[PDB]
PDB file of C-alpha atoms and ligand atoms in Angstrom:
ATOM      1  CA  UNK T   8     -55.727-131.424-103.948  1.00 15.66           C
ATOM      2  CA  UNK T   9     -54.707-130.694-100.641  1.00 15.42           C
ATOM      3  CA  UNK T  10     -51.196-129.919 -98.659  1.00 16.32           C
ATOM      4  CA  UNK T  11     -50.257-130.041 -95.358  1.00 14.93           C
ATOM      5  CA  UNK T  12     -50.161-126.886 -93.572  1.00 14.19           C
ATOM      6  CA  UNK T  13     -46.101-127.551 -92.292  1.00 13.81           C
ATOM      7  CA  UNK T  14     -45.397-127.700 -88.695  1.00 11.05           C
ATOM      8  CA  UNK T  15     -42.428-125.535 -88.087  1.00 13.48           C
ATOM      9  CA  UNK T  16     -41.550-125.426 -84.655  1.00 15.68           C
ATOM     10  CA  UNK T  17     -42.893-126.683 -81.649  1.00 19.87           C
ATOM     11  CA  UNK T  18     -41.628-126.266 -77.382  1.00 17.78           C
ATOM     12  CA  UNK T  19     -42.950-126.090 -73.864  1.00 16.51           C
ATOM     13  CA  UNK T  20     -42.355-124.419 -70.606  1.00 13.15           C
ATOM     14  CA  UNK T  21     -42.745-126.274 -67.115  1.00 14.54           C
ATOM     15  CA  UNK T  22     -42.540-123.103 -65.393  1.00 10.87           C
ATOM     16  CA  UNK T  23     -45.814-121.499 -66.831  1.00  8.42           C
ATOM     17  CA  UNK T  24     -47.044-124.853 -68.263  1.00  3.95           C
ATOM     18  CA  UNK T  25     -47.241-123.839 -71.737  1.00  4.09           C
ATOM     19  CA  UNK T  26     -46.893-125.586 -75.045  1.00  7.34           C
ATOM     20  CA  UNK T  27     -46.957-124.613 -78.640  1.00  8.48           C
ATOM     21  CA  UNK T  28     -46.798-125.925 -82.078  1.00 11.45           C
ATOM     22  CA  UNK T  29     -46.253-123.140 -84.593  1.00 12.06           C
ATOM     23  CA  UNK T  30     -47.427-123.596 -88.027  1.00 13.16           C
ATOM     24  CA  UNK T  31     -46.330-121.811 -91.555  1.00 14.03           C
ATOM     25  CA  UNK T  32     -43.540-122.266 -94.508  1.00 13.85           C
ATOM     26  CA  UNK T  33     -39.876-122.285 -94.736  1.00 15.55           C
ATOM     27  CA  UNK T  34     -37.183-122.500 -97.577  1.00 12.21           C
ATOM     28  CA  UNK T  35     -37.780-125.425 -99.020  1.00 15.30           C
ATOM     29  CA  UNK T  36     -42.179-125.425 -98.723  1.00 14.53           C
ATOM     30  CA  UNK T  37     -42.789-122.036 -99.470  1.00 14.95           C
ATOM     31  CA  UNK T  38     -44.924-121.883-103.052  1.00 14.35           C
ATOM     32  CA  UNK T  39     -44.394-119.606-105.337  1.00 12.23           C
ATOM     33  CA  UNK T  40     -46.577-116.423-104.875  1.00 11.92           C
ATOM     34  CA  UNK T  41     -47.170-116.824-101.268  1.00 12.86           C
ATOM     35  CA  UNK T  42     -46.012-113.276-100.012  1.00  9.52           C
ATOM     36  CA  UNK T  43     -45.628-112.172 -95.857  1.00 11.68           C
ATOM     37  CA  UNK T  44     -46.503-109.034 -94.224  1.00  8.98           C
ATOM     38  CA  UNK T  45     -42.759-107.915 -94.769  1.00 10.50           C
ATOM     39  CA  UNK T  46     -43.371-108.084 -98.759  1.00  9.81           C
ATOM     40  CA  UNK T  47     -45.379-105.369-101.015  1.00  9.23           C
ATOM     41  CA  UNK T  48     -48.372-107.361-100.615  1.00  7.12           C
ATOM     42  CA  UNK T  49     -49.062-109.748 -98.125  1.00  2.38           C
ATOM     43  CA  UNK T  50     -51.179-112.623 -99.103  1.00  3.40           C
ATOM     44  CA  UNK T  51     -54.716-113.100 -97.803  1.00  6.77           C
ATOM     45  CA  UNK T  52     -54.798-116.551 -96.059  1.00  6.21           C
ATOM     46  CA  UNK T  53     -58.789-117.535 -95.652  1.00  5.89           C
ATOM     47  CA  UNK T  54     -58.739-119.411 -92.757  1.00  5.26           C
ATOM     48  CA  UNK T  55     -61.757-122.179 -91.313  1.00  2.00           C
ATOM     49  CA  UNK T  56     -60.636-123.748 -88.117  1.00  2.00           C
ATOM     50  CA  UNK T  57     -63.155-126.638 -86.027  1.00  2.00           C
ATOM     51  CA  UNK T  58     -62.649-127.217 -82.756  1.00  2.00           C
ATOM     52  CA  UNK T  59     -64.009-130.012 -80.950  1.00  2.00           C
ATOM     53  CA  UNK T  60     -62.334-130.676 -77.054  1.00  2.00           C
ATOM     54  CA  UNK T  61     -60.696-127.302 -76.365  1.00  2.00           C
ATOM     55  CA  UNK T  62     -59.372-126.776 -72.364  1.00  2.00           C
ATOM     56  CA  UNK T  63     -56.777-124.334 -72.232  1.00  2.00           C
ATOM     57  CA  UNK T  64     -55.871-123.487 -76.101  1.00  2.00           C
ATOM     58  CA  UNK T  65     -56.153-120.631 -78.494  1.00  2.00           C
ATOM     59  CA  UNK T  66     -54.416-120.167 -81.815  1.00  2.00           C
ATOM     60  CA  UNK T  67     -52.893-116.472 -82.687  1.00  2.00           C
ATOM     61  CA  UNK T  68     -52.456-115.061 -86.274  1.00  2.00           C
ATOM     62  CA  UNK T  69     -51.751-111.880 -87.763  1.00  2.00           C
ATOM     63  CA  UNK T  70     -54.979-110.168 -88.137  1.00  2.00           C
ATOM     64  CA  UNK T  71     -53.649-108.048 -90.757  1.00  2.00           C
ATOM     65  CA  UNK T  72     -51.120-106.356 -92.667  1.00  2.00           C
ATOM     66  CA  UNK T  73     -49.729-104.700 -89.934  1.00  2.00           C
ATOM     67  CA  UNK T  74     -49.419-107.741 -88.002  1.00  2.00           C
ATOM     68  CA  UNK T  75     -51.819-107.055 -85.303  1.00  2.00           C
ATOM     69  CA  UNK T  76     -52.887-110.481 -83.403  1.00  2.00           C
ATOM     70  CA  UNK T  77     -56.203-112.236 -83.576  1.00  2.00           C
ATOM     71  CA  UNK T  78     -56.815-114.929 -81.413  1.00  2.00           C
ATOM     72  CA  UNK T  79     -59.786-118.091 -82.037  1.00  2.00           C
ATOM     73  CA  UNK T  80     -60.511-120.960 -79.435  1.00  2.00           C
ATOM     74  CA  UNK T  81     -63.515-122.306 -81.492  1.00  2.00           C
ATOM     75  CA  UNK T  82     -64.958-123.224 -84.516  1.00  2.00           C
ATOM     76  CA  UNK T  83     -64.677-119.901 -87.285  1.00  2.00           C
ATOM     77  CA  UNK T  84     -63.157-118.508 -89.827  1.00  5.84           C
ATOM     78  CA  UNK T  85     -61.106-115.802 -90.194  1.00  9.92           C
ATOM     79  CA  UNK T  86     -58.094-113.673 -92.120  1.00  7.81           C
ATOM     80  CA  UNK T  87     -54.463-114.813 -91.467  1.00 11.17           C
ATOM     81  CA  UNK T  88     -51.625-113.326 -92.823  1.00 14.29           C
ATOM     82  CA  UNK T  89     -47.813-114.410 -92.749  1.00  9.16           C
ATOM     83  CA  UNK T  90     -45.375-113.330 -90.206  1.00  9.93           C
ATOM     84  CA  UNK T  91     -42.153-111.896 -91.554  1.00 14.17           C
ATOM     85  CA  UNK T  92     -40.556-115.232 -90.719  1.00 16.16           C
ATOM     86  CA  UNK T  93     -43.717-117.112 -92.848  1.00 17.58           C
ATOM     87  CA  UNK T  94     -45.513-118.134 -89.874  1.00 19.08           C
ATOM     88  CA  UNK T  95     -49.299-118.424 -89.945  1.00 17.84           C
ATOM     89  CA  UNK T  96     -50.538-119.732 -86.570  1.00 18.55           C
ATOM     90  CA  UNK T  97     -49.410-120.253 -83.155  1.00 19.44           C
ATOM     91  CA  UNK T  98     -51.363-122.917 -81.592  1.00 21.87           C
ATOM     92  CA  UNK T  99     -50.923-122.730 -77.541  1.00 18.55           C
ATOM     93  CA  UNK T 100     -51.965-124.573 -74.639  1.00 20.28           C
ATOM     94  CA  UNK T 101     -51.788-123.132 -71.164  1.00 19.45           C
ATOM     95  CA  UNK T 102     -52.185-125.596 -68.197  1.00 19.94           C
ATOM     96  CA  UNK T 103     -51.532-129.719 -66.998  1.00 17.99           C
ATOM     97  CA  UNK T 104     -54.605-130.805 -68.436  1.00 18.56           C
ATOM     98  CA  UNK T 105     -54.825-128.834 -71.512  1.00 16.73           C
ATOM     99  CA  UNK T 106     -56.040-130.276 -74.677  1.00 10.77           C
ATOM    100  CA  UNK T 107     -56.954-129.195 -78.027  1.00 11.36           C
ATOM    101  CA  UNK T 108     -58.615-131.302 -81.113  1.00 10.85           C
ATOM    102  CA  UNK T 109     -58.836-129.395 -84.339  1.00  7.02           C
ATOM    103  CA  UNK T 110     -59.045-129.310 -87.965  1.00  4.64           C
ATOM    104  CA  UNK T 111     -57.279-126.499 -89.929  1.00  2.00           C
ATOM    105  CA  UNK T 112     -57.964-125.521 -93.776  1.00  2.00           C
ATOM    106  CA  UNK T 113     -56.533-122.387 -94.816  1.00  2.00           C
ATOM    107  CA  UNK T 114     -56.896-120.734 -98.376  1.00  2.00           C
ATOM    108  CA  UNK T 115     -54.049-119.054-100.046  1.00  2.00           C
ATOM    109  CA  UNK T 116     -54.188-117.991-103.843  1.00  2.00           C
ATOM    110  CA  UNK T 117     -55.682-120.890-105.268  1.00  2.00           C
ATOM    111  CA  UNK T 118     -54.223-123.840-102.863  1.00  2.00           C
ATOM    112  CA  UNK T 119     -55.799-125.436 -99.860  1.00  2.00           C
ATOM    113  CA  UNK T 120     -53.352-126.185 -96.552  1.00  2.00           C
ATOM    114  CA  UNK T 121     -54.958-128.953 -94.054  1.00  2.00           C
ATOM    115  CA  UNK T 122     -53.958-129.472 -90.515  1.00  2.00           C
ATOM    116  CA  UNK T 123     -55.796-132.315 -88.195  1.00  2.00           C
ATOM    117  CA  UNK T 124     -54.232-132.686 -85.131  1.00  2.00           C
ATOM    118  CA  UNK T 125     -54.164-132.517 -81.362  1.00  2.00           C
ATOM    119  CA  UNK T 126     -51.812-130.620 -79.111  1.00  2.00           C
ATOM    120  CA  UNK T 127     -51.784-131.254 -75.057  1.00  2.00           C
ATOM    121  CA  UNK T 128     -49.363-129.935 -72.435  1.00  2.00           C
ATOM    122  CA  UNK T 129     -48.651-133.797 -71.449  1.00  2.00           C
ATOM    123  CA  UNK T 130     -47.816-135.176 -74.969  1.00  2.00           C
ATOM    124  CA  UNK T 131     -45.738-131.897 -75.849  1.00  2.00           C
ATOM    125  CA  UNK T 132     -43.847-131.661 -72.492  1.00  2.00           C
ATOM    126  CA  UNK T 133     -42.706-135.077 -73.379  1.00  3.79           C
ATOM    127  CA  UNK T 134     -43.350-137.159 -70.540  1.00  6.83           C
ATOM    128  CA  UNK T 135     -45.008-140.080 -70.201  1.00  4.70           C
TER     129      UNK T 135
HETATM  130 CL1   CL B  19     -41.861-107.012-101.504  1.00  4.40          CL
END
């Protein structure tokens, strides 16, 4: 069935009050076929996000094969593509109280990647 869409990175700023978690494949997780927009032929990722609480967050992609960015903060679906350096979404939060729940399934020739998860500028700024 299912895999995990892999986290790959994730930081903050306390100057600007940011946070991110970046999603998308490295060396050892990246499955055979799965091409970015630096390869011949990109693959299509078919993306449905849910939102539920959202203050503050947005997720960027590449739009398309030219890498131009899209940007959701609710519910949708959409076309993703991989970055050069296989990532597929930025998730971001901007502000002290910002908070995102969400749900993640992307499409990408014949395999499903899930992501539930939460991201707030408390919990990633790592205080208490
Ligand atoms: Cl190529």
């Amino acid at each position: 069935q299912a895999r995990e869409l892999p986290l790959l990175k994730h930081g903050y700023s306390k100057k600007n009050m940011t946070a991110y978690n970046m999603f998308g494949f490295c060396c050892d997780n990246t499955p055979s076929g799965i091409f970015n927009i630096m390869d011949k032929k990109p693959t299509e990722f078919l993306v449905n996000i849910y939102v539920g609480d959202n203050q503050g967050c947005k997720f960027i992609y590449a739009a398309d094969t030219k890498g131009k960015q899209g940007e959701i903060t609710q519910t949708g679906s959409f076309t993703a593509y991989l970055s050069g350096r296989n990532e597929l979404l930025k998730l971001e939060c901007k502000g002290k109280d910002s908070n995102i729940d969400y749900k993640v399934i992307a499409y990408a020739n014949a395999i499903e990647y899930d992501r539930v998860g939460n991201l707030s500028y408390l919990v990633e700024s790592g205080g208490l």
